Subunit: 114 residues, 2 copies
Amino acid sequence: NPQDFAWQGLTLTPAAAIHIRELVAKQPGMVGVRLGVKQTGCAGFGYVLDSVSEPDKDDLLFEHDGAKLFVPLQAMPFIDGTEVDFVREGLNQIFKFHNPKAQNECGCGESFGV
Amino acid sequence: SGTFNPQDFAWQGLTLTPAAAIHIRELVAKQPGMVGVRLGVKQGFGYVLDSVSEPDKDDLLFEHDGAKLFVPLQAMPFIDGTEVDFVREGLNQIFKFHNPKA
């Protein structure tokens, strides 16, 4: 099992879009962010948002309000439909991932981004 | 005999990993007037960091490498012994909390 499969795609909330536009804007050569997924836990799987300059051949592109979100095909399966959001509040800065298929959203509140 | 007060308890205290220490120093340096961060809990519960200018009366202080971490007394019975570490995940810079009672 690999692709050529029509996905619904992924989204950025306006907040996530503004922030990505702001990191583009301080940062030259940055075209967008890229969601990958990493092995973790028992047969677990973590999200990983990264600054990107040179997209891979295989990436897909989901553009909202000028912000680019490149997602690898070998990832679409495990994360089709996720919306990427960004919450900034006082000292907390973080990119959050809402997978529609996931139910069981994290409890282990054993993290704080800044 | 047996009579006590947890405000006068001897705590194991919280620790800071060397990576958490520098990012705290880094967060503090960026803000003139800030002297450290305060670890708290909210809400099935979660850790939150707050900026500290003037520390509270009932706040305990844990120093390590010039990094000041404040913890209120009301939270000590619950997060004492906790270790604060730091990890970068893509664009996320995230403080992590290892609590011996997780």
